[PDB]
Amino acid sequence: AEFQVTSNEIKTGEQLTTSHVFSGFGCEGGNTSPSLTWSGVPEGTKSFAVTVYDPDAPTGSGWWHWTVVNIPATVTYLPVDAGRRDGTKLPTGAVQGRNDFGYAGFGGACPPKGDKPHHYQFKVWALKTEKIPVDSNSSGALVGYMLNANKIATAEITPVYEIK
């Protein structure tokens, strides 16, 4: 309840803008991660992580759009485009895992044309461990296994997106 997250670019239940849409697969978006600002950090938090996941992608496993772990416990915000794949806007110490598009960084929305809106779960994790062993080869599931094993609390924002 106390552990919360907000953004200046996205909000729960509201259609994503073009800026956070993937560039590829017929989708021609900005492919930029929205900013995230958390609050209410749980006592004893040793690191944060952010994951973005679409449960509605018709794959059998959803779709992992972004994973970033090992954000220091002293940093309580991520700026716009912190998920860029060259890593120039990551907080010092943080590392990006591999998304389902096949690269380490943020990949925006790209739902099937004509589908009902997909839910993009942006989640900030408060973790009981300073560091987990992830690199640019870590699948979304491997990251999620480790985050679930060290979770204290999670905060989420769930924008939606559909292609008219």
Place this chain on the structure above:
Amino acid sequence: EFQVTSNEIKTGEQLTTSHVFSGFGCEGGNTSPSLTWSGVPEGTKSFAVTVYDPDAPTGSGWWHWTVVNIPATVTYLPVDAGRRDGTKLPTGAVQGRNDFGYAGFGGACPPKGDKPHHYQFKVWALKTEKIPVDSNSSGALVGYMLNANKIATAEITPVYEIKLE
């Protein structure tokens, strides 16, 4: 009508050590079981095999193996066809990346003391000859393409558990 059998695995039966991962504290043989399918449906132009555990505690289950572009003339995968060096893969087939991070079969490795996990070994009859998959294709990406080209599927679901005591 589309069906699959195996000499090494069976629905609801405990996996033997041959099919348990080698890594993450698991000390198995990490070998894929054989699979033989039949009842191939009219329209089939290739086959695919996937291995998925929905009970893995990750938020997206766990992709243990993906193999696609199995020529429409083959109805069998031999034991160890999923070795990552590709030495036992049928010609033409390609393996996608599993959640362990490699292109090849990775066996079971559930948390100690957990409820038994159900490993879905599934064969797919597809309406297309080739789908663009490579060693970097994630399990979701492969899954996206198989569901879009599916004619029929058959599956076997063995289980595996590691007691703490």
